[PDB]
Amino acid sequence: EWNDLMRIEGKAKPPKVKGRSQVQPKLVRRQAEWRYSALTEPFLGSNKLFKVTPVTWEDVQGARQNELVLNYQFRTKLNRVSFIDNYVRSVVDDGTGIVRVGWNREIRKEKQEVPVFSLFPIQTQEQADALQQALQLRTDNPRGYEENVDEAIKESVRFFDETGQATYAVQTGTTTTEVEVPLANHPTVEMLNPENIIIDPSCQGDINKAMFAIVSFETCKADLLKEKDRYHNLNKIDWQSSAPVNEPDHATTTPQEFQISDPMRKRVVAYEYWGFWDIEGNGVLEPIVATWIGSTLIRLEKNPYPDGKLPFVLIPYMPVKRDMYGEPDAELLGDNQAVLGAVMRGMIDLLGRSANGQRGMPKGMLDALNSRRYREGEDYEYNPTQNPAQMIIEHKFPELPQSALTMATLQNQEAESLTGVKAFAGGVTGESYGDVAAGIRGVLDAASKREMAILRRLAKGMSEIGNKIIAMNAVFLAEHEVVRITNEEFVTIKREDLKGNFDLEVDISTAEVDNQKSQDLGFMLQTIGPNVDQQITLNILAEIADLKRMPKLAHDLRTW
Amino acid sequence: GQRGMPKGMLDALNSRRYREGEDYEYNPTQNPAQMIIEHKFPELPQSALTM
Amino acid sequence: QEFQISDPMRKRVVAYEYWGFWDIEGNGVLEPIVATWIGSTLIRLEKNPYPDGKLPFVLIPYMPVKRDMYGEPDAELLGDNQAVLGAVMRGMIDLLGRSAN
Amino acid sequence: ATLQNQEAESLTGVKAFAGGVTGESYGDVAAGIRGVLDAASKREMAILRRLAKGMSEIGNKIIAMNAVFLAEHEVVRITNEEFVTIKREDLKGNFDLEVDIS
Amino acid sequence: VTPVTWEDVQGARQNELVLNYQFRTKLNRVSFIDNYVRSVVDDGTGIVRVG
Amino acid sequence: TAEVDNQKSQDLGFMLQTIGPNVDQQITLNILAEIADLKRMPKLAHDLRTW
Amino acid sequence: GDINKAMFAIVSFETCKADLLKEKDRYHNLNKIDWQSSAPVNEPDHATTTP
Amino acid sequence: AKGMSEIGNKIIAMNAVFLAEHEVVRITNEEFVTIKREDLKGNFDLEVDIS
Amino acid sequence: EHLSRELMNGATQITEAVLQKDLLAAAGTVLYAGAATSDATITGEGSTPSVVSYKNLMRLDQILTENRTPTQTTIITGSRMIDTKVIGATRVMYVGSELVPELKAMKDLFGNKAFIETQHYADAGTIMNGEVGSIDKFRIIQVPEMLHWAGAGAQATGANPGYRTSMVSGQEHYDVYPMLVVGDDSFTSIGFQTDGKSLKFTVMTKMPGKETADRNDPYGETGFSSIKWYYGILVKRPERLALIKTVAPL
Amino acid sequence: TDSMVPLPDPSQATKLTSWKNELSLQALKADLDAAKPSHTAMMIKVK
């Protein structure tokens, strides 16, 4: 119903009459149209999306790694702008937004020749010199080690890593081996249509207390075959004949008459069950995931992600107390829209039904010849009894009453008062989002604070999504991937500590926050005596240089 | 939007011409400028807005 | 609609391409391919040459529609206003022009 | 006529002789810091970001193609510096580079 | 184009030079930009083919 | 609240100005450390504390 | 007029068997309760949004 | 301005071939700078714009 | 939960029956077996029983080819397994359980068997759900819930060779059984937007308690559960729907 | 000449490449005709 009010469909549509208008101006769409672009912009103001801040002093390196990797993932593996636009538009239009967070992985084996090396003890000083140069290059620059060291020295260094003794290697021959090459290893976030997902109704207004959640999606057999081990029992489901997509409950934008001839690329609707179940029967609830297509159960296992919660994030637009869902603006504005539309239609009917351009001429004022002369466009003579200045009538538009304009103005004022959105005002709330940026001593009119509150509600959802992705990255990504992305030493996070988010904090990064942080760093540099400690000053300068987007200068000041 | 036309101002053919949307001729005893009425919204009293 | 160069080599004809994923080996793996055909003849068939491995098209929407690829311009919002404004101006011109001056 | 014009300007957000200076403050360091824009300018700024993302994608694809097709001597001729080699495994995943409009 | 890590400055410099040279020489930038924006605004969607 | 932190920072700075920087080393180190903590920079604060 | 001076306070909440079994020692006599049925339909005092 | 730039580029390319050395030396009064024939096709090492 | 489960099962059965009978009613191409001209002329007695033959299936194939109806499946080239046959059949036909023996007994033009079973080509092909064989250009699918007009044929007398009959107002009449071939993109099931889509079961229930208390029943000891849905079909190309009417053995 | 088109809308394998499974022209054209109705409906709005 709320969407129908927005788009002018269903009950919102004006009735159709043969001789009268059906013009309905769009109020709710307008009020939402300013709100969208007001809200989207803060998330697109900078090149980096996520800001990770260490909680304690050991956490600087971990925060730097996680910020680097998370920013790289969001910048490369996703279309950030489209995701942000859909997220904001859905939150505004439906009153709530469900985000599904998952992981994507596809592994293909290959055969390549790997040379076989025979070890030999380190002889003389030259072998040790070359080995030490290799180790030093590995410490200073991992990419240089990968690209320029060569294979035999790499094998010697690996054996030195395994055992203290150093050796020198000479190749003998090449033997074929099988290697796993990951084509795709990246998290995926995708917004969900509300009609798809069903949540436990007995959660009493909190997503955490929910027992189960069921989501229905479209999938093709290639997706199921990407990871063979996870799914069992795929032969019973037909993949050859049935080619409508017609499952009623599932709601989708796919055209109805469209299916691929190829059996493997055919799409079938599947269901998932994320929830808690008593697997051992002794009263301990544990998370599980299940999947079934039609009437066949293909997948059954525990929750794979380290977090241990359902992979869904729920955000309300305008909250209702003690309830999951939210409310949009259309609920308040339906009646104002209806009355404004009625007024405008009446105005247009008044103008349209009238006669315009018609000329009425009295009988007997002009005889035949003078009538023809008048109609042709030349001079004439009229009977003196009747005065053609007053008697010849040329019709016009009727004059509009003041009631229509007054009522339209009243409706617009009431809509603006309730919602708090005006035509050409506001929108600068995104600049003052950051605490240090302008949240300190920030003065904004009454209307800006409602927009700021909605902005905070969206930023919380972004923080939760980032936290989930960080938790998944801690386990799923390997060491060499992180080293390649960051070019720094890998830091390991113990598996026990994943459940409770320790030592790191996630929030959105904007342009002004970095500027104010630079200002405060310069202030601290002035306040402290620059000659007190060289290392402290170098660390401050490197930190300032990092915010101003100069990696080379920052690294140069760090390793000075 | 309703239009009310006096009886006897226009005969059959002139009335059909007027309805179709072209020129006509009226009886001089009746004045179409004032007699033909086109109803509009009534004017709101100021008391409602004041209250 | 009436244009054809006389040189046979320089005549221009319509051709189709298919950039997509296919199971080339039948083992269950989807790999990118390209195919070109004219009329009823297949003239080219091979894997995706570009390094990125994706379809070489970049799509940009003007006003996004939630959970849909295409976008919408401003004409949706403005058609009715344009019609009524045109009607009013035509009315004023008729009022002036039809009169005798 | 006045009412229709006002409604059109309100829905679309374009006035006759107003706006247009949005592109001058696009840059992050340039004016994104402490850049105050009226309510009309941010819609145009959003559309400009949507276009800039498409330009970034095109630039990245063309970089990917240049990494393979162009030979060494052509690049050395154009830039007059030593050549830098990108391994083939690194082509699929975009590392070490970021593209944006200047 | 800007480097993500500190060893990437040389690669970024070469890529910027080569890409800018290609766009200024092998293309008519003004016509392409005009077509790009006009298509996006008129149709609401703009599809670019890269080859 | 956000502004409370700023005002505490300013009060600490004023006290550091009134007191001689060379009067006592430990006092000024601690003043700087809790100035740093309010500015959300933990490593620096710990670094001046154990200096 | 003061919550501190109150002698008693009574609250009614919804719970499941697994929550009570989280702490086996704290609760006793769980067996007597009829877990089957015993729905919130029985109590018309408790106010909730549950279907 | 783009059209004027294209005109300038064409005329530079034509000058590189048709003009002799002594004419260029007379006009500029400086040592002659030679451009090889292969590099004419791709307009490297120069940029033309309105001043 | 037992009552609710039975309610939902009944709803699904009713929906299936309604859709299938609408499809049977709206069928552009109808080919009466034997030498009949309408439902009344269908008979199993006399010289010519109204029972399908090879020529009827061949004619139906020819008509569907002329109407340009797209095919559904692909031919099968057999494997290297002994006693395996190749089948050229490209369309799908739905028959009831009453007609299958007659289809089994049928012979082709040259007197050979015309019903190839599924065990012969189970290898080197795919067996659809409910498939029981393939004849000529048609593969046969058996629908357990298939309907049949009853007491619609001609009058039944003592010369009855054995075909099924039904009683109508004190006199017996022969039954009529269909075989339906739905062509691609022929019909669509219509439905409203707000509240009711095409086939959505909207279930409401009010357990006894405060909410069902009213002036008629001040205490409140009642209840109800209800289930509802919308339906409607639009036929785009009726020329593609095919039907054959015939009697069936007992 | 050379008889008519040797395959039913190039069904089966034309044998351009060495892949075990080859696309054939019929499958590609079939996907095209499947997709075309929606695109035709969409282009009316742009028009």
PDB file of C-alpha atoms in Angstrom, chain I residues 24-240:
ATOM      1  CA  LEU I  24      -9.658 -29.052 -21.169  1.00  0.00           C
ATOM      2  CA  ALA I  25     -12.601 -26.735 -21.833  1.00  0.00           C
ATOM      3  CA  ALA I  26     -10.527 -24.225 -23.845  1.00  0.00           C
ATOM      4  CA  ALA I  27      -8.871 -26.257 -26.611  1.00  0.00           C
ATOM      5  CA  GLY I  28      -8.628 -24.951 -30.160  1.00  0.00           C
ATOM      6  CA  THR I  29      -7.635 -28.198 -31.892  1.00  0.00           C
ATOM      7  CA  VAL I  30      -9.953 -31.144 -31.188  1.00  0.00           C
ATOM      8  CA  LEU I  31      -9.707 -34.491 -33.007  1.00  0.00           C
ATOM      9  CA  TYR I  32     -12.536 -36.895 -32.216  1.00  0.00           C
ATOM     10  CA  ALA I  33     -11.373 -40.488 -32.421  1.00  0.00           C
ATOM     11  CA  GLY I  34     -13.227 -43.008 -34.555  1.00  0.00           C
ATOM     12  CA  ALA I  35     -15.762 -41.344 -36.844  1.00  0.00           C
ATOM     13  CA  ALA I  36     -17.651 -39.091 -34.438  1.00  0.00           C
ATOM     14  CA  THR I  37     -18.825 -35.519 -34.989  1.00  0.00           C
ATOM     15  CA  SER I  38     -19.510 -34.401 -31.400  1.00  0.00           C
ATOM     16  CA  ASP I  39     -19.654 -35.739 -27.853  1.00  0.00           C
ATOM     17  CA  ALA I  40     -23.014 -37.420 -28.464  1.00  0.00           C
ATOM     18  CA  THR I  41     -21.790 -39.487 -31.413  1.00  0.00           C
ATOM     19  CA  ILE I  42     -18.973 -41.087 -29.402  1.00  0.00           C
ATOM     20  CA  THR I  43     -19.681 -44.794 -28.997  1.00  0.00           C
ATOM     21  CA  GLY I  44     -17.910 -48.082 -28.439  1.00  0.00           C
ATOM     22  CA  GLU I  45     -20.526 -50.331 -30.015  1.00  0.00           C
ATOM     23  CA  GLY I  46     -21.322 -50.893 -33.658  1.00  0.00           C
ATOM     24  CA  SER I  47     -18.913 -51.324 -36.533  1.00  0.00           C
ATOM     25  CA  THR I  48     -16.535 -48.495 -35.604  1.00  0.00           C
ATOM     26  CA  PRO I  49     -15.530 -48.069 -31.935  1.00  0.00           C
ATOM     27  CA  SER I  50     -14.285 -44.562 -31.115  1.00  0.00           C
ATOM     28  CA  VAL I  51     -10.799 -45.673 -30.082  1.00  0.00           C
ATOM     29  CA  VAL I  52      -7.568 -43.994 -31.154  1.00  0.00           C
ATOM     30  CA  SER I  53      -5.240 -45.471 -33.770  1.00  0.00           C
ATOM     31  CA  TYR I  54      -1.851 -44.723 -35.296  1.00  0.00           C
ATOM     32  CA  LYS I  55      -3.380 -42.582 -38.050  1.00  0.00           C
ATOM     33  CA  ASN I  56      -5.009 -40.297 -35.475  1.00  0.00           C
ATOM     34  CA  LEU I  57      -1.672 -39.577 -33.804  1.00  0.00           C
ATOM     35  CA  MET I  58      -0.011 -39.025 -37.184  1.00  0.00           C
ATOM     36  CA  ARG I  59      -2.727 -36.554 -38.199  1.00  0.00           C
ATOM     37  CA  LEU I  60      -2.431 -34.700 -34.890  1.00  0.00           C
ATOM     38  CA  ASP I  61       1.325 -34.416 -35.424  1.00  0.00           C
ATOM     39  CA  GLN I  62       0.765 -33.097 -38.950  1.00  0.00           C
ATOM     40  CA  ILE I  63      -1.734 -30.484 -37.761  1.00  0.00           C
ATOM     41  CA  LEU I  64       0.587 -29.305 -34.991  1.00  0.00           C
ATOM     42  CA  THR I  65       3.443 -29.017 -37.487  1.00  0.00           C
ATOM     43  CA  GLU I  66       1.249 -26.954 -39.819  1.00  0.00           C
ATOM     44  CA  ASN I  67       0.186 -24.620 -36.989  1.00  0.00           C
ATOM     45  CA  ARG I  68       3.922 -23.969 -36.379  1.00  0.00           C
ATOM     46  CA  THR I  69       3.712 -25.104 -32.749  1.00  0.00           C
ATOM     47  CA  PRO I  70       7.267 -25.299 -31.340  1.00  0.00           C
ATOM     48  CA  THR I  71       8.569 -28.681 -30.258  1.00  0.00           C
ATOM     49  CA  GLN I  72       9.350 -29.572 -26.648  1.00  0.00           C
ATOM     50  CA  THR I  73      12.076 -32.244 -26.557  1.00  0.00           C
ATOM     51  CA  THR I  74      14.877 -33.729 -28.654  1.00  0.00           C
ATOM     52  CA  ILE I  75      15.302 -37.117 -30.296  1.00  0.00           C
ATOM     53  CA  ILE I  76      17.293 -39.882 -28.602  1.00  0.00           C
ATOM     54  CA  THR I  77      20.143 -41.798 -30.196  1.00  0.00           C
ATOM     55  CA  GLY I  78      20.642 -44.991 -28.257  1.00  0.00           C
ATOM     56  CA  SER I  79      23.645 -46.213 -26.323  1.00  0.00           C
ATOM     57  CA  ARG I  80      25.803 -49.319 -26.800  1.00  0.00           C
ATOM     58  CA  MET I  81      23.582 -51.442 -24.527  1.00  0.00           C
ATOM     59  CA  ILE I  82      21.932 -54.554 -25.932  1.00  0.00           C
ATOM     60  CA  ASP I  83      18.170 -54.402 -26.582  1.00  0.00           C
ATOM     61  CA  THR I  84      18.026 -50.592 -26.636  1.00  0.00           C
ATOM     62  CA  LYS I  85      15.960 -48.673 -29.185  1.00  0.00           C
ATOM     63  CA  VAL I  86      16.165 -45.187 -30.658  1.00  0.00           C
ATOM     64  CA  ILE I  87      13.098 -42.974 -30.282  1.00  0.00           C
ATOM     65  CA  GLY I  88      12.180 -40.017 -32.417  1.00  0.00           C
ATOM     66  CA  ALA I  89       9.536 -38.220 -30.386  1.00  0.00           C
ATOM     67  CA  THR I  90       9.436 -34.530 -29.679  1.00  0.00           C
ATOM     68  CA  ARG I  91       6.084 -33.642 -28.093  1.00  0.00           C
ATOM     69  CA  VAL I  92       4.573 -34.447 -24.691  1.00  0.00           C
ATOM     70  CA  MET I  93       1.075 -35.828 -24.126  1.00  0.00           C
ATOM     71  CA  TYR I  94      -0.869 -36.304 -20.888  1.00  0.00           C
ATOM     72  CA  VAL I  95      -3.171 -39.318 -20.535  1.00  0.00           C
ATOM     73  CA  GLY I  96      -5.113 -40.747 -17.629  1.00  0.00           C
ATOM     74  CA  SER I  97      -4.636 -44.105 -15.967  1.00  0.00           C
ATOM     75  CA  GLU I  98      -7.734 -45.471 -17.713  1.00  0.00           C
ATOM     76  CA  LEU I  99      -6.319 -45.182 -21.243  1.00  0.00           C
ATOM     77  CA  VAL I 100      -2.887 -46.784 -20.760  1.00  0.00           C
ATOM     78  CA  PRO I 101      -3.768 -50.437 -21.612  1.00  0.00           C
ATOM     79  CA  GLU I 102      -5.391 -49.383 -24.883  1.00  0.00           C
ATOM     80  CA  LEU I 103      -2.266 -47.407 -25.767  1.00  0.00           C
ATOM     81  CA  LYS I 104      -0.206 -50.505 -24.963  1.00  0.00           C
ATOM     82  CA  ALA I 105      -2.214 -52.799 -27.235  1.00  0.00           C
ATOM     83  CA  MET I 106      -1.989 -50.490 -30.271  1.00  0.00           C
ATOM     84  CA  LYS I 107      -0.208 -51.551 -33.474  1.00  0.00           C
ATOM     85  CA  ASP I 108       1.466 -49.444 -36.160  1.00  0.00           C
ATOM     86  CA  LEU I 109       1.003 -49.435 -39.935  1.00  0.00           C
ATOM     87  CA  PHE I 110       3.020 -52.617 -40.565  1.00  0.00           C
ATOM     88  CA  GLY I 111       1.557 -54.627 -37.677  1.00  0.00           C
ATOM     89  CA  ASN I 112       4.454 -54.104 -35.265  1.00  0.00           C
ATOM     90  CA  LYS I 113       4.282 -52.912 -31.670  1.00  0.00           C
ATOM     91  CA  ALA I 114       3.913 -49.147 -31.327  1.00  0.00           C
ATOM     92  CA  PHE I 115       4.423 -48.538 -27.572  1.00  0.00           C
ATOM     93  CA  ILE I 116       8.102 -48.337 -26.664  1.00  0.00           C
ATOM     94  CA  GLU I 117       8.493 -48.600 -22.894  1.00  0.00           C
ATOM     95  CA  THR I 118      10.752 -46.454 -20.724  1.00  0.00           C
ATOM     96  CA  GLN I 119      13.136 -49.259 -19.766  1.00  0.00           C
ATOM     97  CA  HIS I 120      14.426 -49.460 -23.338  1.00  0.00           C
ATOM     98  CA  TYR I 121      15.679 -45.862 -23.542  1.00  0.00           C
ATOM     99  CA  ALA I 122      16.165 -45.084 -19.849  1.00  0.00           C
ATOM    100  CA  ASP I 123      19.848 -45.054 -20.716  1.00  0.00           C
ATOM    101  CA  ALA I 124      21.090 -42.374 -23.164  1.00  0.00           C
ATOM    102  CA  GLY I 125      18.120 -40.168 -22.281  1.00  0.00           C
ATOM    103  CA  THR I 126      16.164 -38.594 -19.455  1.00  0.00           C
ATOM    104  CA  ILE I 127      12.877 -39.945 -18.108  1.00  0.00           C
ATOM    105  CA  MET I 128      10.458 -37.208 -17.086  1.00  0.00           C
ATOM    106  CA  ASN I 129       8.275 -37.499 -14.013  1.00  0.00           C
ATOM    107  CA  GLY I 130       5.398 -39.893 -14.602  1.00  0.00           C
ATOM    108  CA  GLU I 131       6.632 -41.019 -18.015  1.00  0.00           C
ATOM    109  CA  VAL I 132       5.365 -44.438 -19.112  1.00  0.00           C
ATOM    110  CA  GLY I 133       6.593 -44.669 -22.706  1.00  0.00           C
ATOM    111  CA  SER I 134       6.621 -42.984 -26.089  1.00  0.00           C
ATOM    112  CA  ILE I 135       4.510 -43.500 -29.220  1.00  0.00           C
ATOM    113  CA  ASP I 136       5.185 -42.131 -32.716  1.00  0.00           C
ATOM    114  CA  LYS I 137       6.231 -38.476 -32.165  1.00  0.00           C
ATOM    115  CA  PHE I 138       4.672 -38.189 -28.676  1.00  0.00           C
ATOM    116  CA  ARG I 139       6.060 -39.049 -25.266  1.00  0.00           C
ATOM    117  CA  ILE I 140       3.404 -40.246 -22.826  1.00  0.00           C
ATOM    118  CA  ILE I 141       2.931 -38.791 -19.335  1.00  0.00           C
ATOM    119  CA  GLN I 142       0.404 -40.207 -16.865  1.00  0.00           C
ATOM    120  CA  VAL I 143      -1.438 -37.699 -14.665  1.00  0.00           C
ATOM    121  CA  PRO I 144      -3.077 -39.494 -11.696  1.00  0.00           C
ATOM    122  CA  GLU I 145      -5.689 -36.755 -11.140  1.00  0.00           C
ATOM    123  CA  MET I 146      -6.842 -36.574 -14.770  1.00  0.00           C
ATOM    124  CA  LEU I 147     -10.566 -35.884 -15.199  1.00  0.00           C
ATOM    125  CA  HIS I 148     -13.140 -37.300 -17.604  1.00  0.00           C
ATOM    126  CA  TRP I 149     -16.606 -36.374 -18.788  1.00  0.00           C
ATOM    127  CA  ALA I 150     -19.059 -38.994 -17.560  1.00  0.00           C
ATOM    128  CA  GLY I 151     -22.208 -40.074 -19.339  1.00  0.00           C
ATOM    129  CA  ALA I 152     -21.395 -37.978 -22.398  1.00  0.00           C
ATOM    130  CA  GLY I 153     -21.164 -40.581 -25.170  1.00  0.00           C
ATOM    131  CA  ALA I 154     -23.897 -42.495 -26.921  1.00  0.00           C
ATOM    132  CA  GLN I 155     -26.347 -44.873 -25.273  1.00  0.00           C
ATOM    133  CA  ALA I 156     -25.060 -48.225 -24.015  1.00  0.00           C
ATOM    134  CA  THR I 157     -26.692 -51.543 -24.903  1.00  0.00           C
ATOM    135  CA  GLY I 158     -26.009 -55.263 -24.670  1.00  0.00           C
ATOM    136  CA  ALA I 159     -23.569 -55.151 -27.595  1.00  0.00           C
ATOM    137  CA  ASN I 160     -21.059 -53.478 -25.241  1.00  0.00           C
ATOM    138  CA  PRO I 161     -17.654 -55.058 -25.995  1.00  0.00           C
ATOM    139  CA  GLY I 162     -16.445 -53.954 -22.560  1.00  0.00           C
ATOM    140  CA  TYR I 163     -15.879 -50.200 -22.631  1.00  0.00           C
ATOM    141  CA  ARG I 164     -16.710 -48.203 -19.517  1.00  0.00           C
ATOM    142  CA  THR I 165     -20.190 -46.753 -19.024  1.00  0.00           C
ATOM    143  CA  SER I 166     -21.919 -44.473 -16.534  1.00  0.00           C
ATOM    144  CA  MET I 167     -25.518 -43.987 -15.442  1.00  0.00           C
ATOM    145  CA  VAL I 168     -27.407 -40.816 -16.377  1.00  0.00           C
ATOM    146  CA  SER I 169     -31.043 -40.299 -15.309  1.00  0.00           C
ATOM    147  CA  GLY I 170     -31.807 -44.015 -15.400  1.00  0.00           C
ATOM    148  CA  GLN I 171     -30.046 -44.779 -18.697  1.00  0.00           C
ATOM    149  CA  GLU I 172     -26.409 -45.687 -19.310  1.00  0.00           C
ATOM    150  CA  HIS I 173     -24.040 -43.613 -21.441  1.00  0.00           C
ATOM    151  CA  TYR I 174     -20.426 -44.073 -22.484  1.00  0.00           C
ATOM    152  CA  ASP I 175     -17.665 -42.044 -20.860  1.00  0.00           C
ATOM    153  CA  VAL I 176     -15.259 -39.768 -22.725  1.00  0.00           C
ATOM    154  CA  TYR I 177     -11.565 -39.546 -21.871  1.00  0.00           C
ATOM    155  CA  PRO I 178      -9.083 -36.894 -23.058  1.00  0.00           C
ATOM    156  CA  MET I 179      -5.439 -36.697 -24.095  1.00  0.00           C
ATOM    157  CA  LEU I 180      -4.048 -33.183 -23.817  1.00  0.00           C
ATOM    158  CA  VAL I 181      -0.984 -31.656 -25.479  1.00  0.00           C
ATOM    159  CA  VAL I 182      -0.227 -28.163 -24.190  1.00  0.00           C
ATOM    160  CA  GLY I 183       1.904 -26.177 -26.612  1.00  0.00           C
ATOM    161  CA  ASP I 184       4.482 -23.658 -25.469  1.00  0.00           C
ATOM    162  CA  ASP I 185       3.240 -20.203 -24.449  1.00  0.00           C
ATOM    163  CA  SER I 186      -0.489 -20.832 -24.788  1.00  0.00           C
ATOM    164  CA  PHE I 187      -2.111 -19.775 -21.507  1.00  0.00           C
ATOM    165  CA  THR I 188      -1.361 -17.640 -18.469  1.00  0.00           C
ATOM    166  CA  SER I 189      -2.959 -17.585 -15.016  1.00  0.00           C
ATOM    167  CA  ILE I 190      -4.122 -14.052 -14.189  1.00  0.00           C
ATOM    168  CA  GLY I 191      -4.150 -12.429 -10.734  1.00  0.00           C
ATOM    169  CA  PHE I 192      -4.577  -9.127  -8.865  1.00  0.00           C
ATOM    170  CA  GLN I 193      -1.778  -7.133  -7.207  1.00  0.00           C
ATOM    171  CA  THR I 194      -2.707  -5.649  -3.875  1.00  0.00           C
ATOM    172  CA  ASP I 195      -3.598  -8.406  -1.430  1.00  0.00           C
ATOM    173  CA  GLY I 196      -4.097 -11.204  -3.951  1.00  0.00           C
ATOM    174  CA  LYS I 197      -1.541 -12.419  -6.473  1.00  0.00           C
ATOM    175  CA  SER I 198      -2.322 -15.204  -8.932  1.00  0.00           C
ATOM    176  CA  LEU I 199      -2.197 -18.201  -6.602  1.00  0.00           C
ATOM    177  CA  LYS I 200      -1.674 -17.075  -3.017  1.00  0.00           C
ATOM    178  CA  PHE I 201      -3.459 -18.707  -0.076  1.00  0.00           C
ATOM    179  CA  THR I 202      -4.466 -16.034   2.438  1.00  0.00           C
ATOM    180  CA  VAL I 203      -5.129 -17.831   5.735  1.00  0.00           C
ATOM    181  CA  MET I 204      -6.804 -16.171   8.729  1.00  0.00           C
ATOM    182  CA  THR I 205      -7.546 -17.752  12.096  1.00  0.00           C
ATOM    183  CA  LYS I 206      -8.946 -16.558  15.424  1.00  0.00           C
ATOM    184  CA  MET I 207      -8.390 -18.848  18.392  1.00  0.00           C
ATOM    185  CA  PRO I 208     -10.910 -18.620  21.259  1.00  0.00           C
ATOM    186  CA  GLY I 209     -10.088 -15.914  23.757  1.00  0.00           C
ATOM    187  CA  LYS I 210     -10.540 -12.198  24.227  1.00  0.00           C
ATOM    188  CA  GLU I 211     -10.405 -11.338  20.518  1.00  0.00           C
ATOM    189  CA  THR I 212     -13.420 -13.509  19.632  1.00  0.00           C
ATOM    190  CA  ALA I 213     -15.566 -12.203  22.498  1.00  0.00           C
ATOM    191  CA  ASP I 214     -18.544 -10.131  21.399  1.00  0.00           C
ATOM    192  CA  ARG I 215     -22.013  -9.095  22.504  1.00  0.00           C
ATOM    193  CA  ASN I 216     -23.603 -12.301  21.192  1.00  0.00           C
ATOM    194  CA  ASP I 217     -21.019 -14.436  23.047  1.00  0.00           C
ATOM    195  CA  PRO I 218     -19.794 -12.396  26.036  1.00  0.00           C
ATOM    196  CA  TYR I 219     -17.434 -15.088  27.309  1.00  0.00           C
ATOM    197  CA  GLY I 220     -16.049 -16.304  23.992  1.00  0.00           C
ATOM    198  CA  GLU I 221     -15.666 -19.984  23.142  1.00  0.00           C
ATOM    199  CA  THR I 222     -15.522 -20.333  19.336  1.00  0.00           C
ATOM    200  CA  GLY I 223     -12.999 -20.117  16.538  1.00  0.00           C
ATOM    201  CA  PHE I 224     -12.439 -20.467  12.828  1.00  0.00           C
ATOM    202  CA  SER I 225      -9.755 -20.876  10.197  1.00  0.00           C
ATOM    203  CA  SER I 226     -10.296 -19.784   6.618  1.00  0.00           C
ATOM    204  CA  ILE I 227      -8.370 -20.074   3.363  1.00  0.00           C
ATOM    205  CA  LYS I 228      -8.954 -18.167   0.120  1.00  0.00           C
ATOM    206  CA  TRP I 229      -7.311 -17.415  -3.222  1.00  0.00           C
ATOM    207  CA  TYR I 230      -7.888 -15.763  -6.605  1.00  0.00           C
ATOM    208  CA  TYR I 231      -7.831 -17.362 -10.056  1.00  0.00           C
ATOM    209  CA  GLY I 232      -8.339 -16.711 -13.755  1.00  0.00           C
ATOM    210  CA  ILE I 233      -6.818 -17.773 -17.059  1.00  0.00           C
ATOM    211  CA  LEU I 234      -6.199 -15.977 -20.348  1.00  0.00           C
ATOM    212  CA  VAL I 235      -5.498 -18.004 -23.494  1.00  0.00           C
ATOM    213  CA  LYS I 236      -3.106 -16.338 -25.923  1.00  0.00           C
ATOM    214  CA  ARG I 237      -2.784 -18.984 -28.643  1.00  0.00           C
ATOM    215  CA  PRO I 238      -5.657 -21.496 -28.443  1.00  0.00           C
ATOM    216  CA  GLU I 239      -4.547 -23.098 -31.712  1.00  0.00           C
ATOM    217  CA  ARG I 240      -1.664 -24.699 -29.820  1.00  0.00           C
TER     218      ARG I 240
END
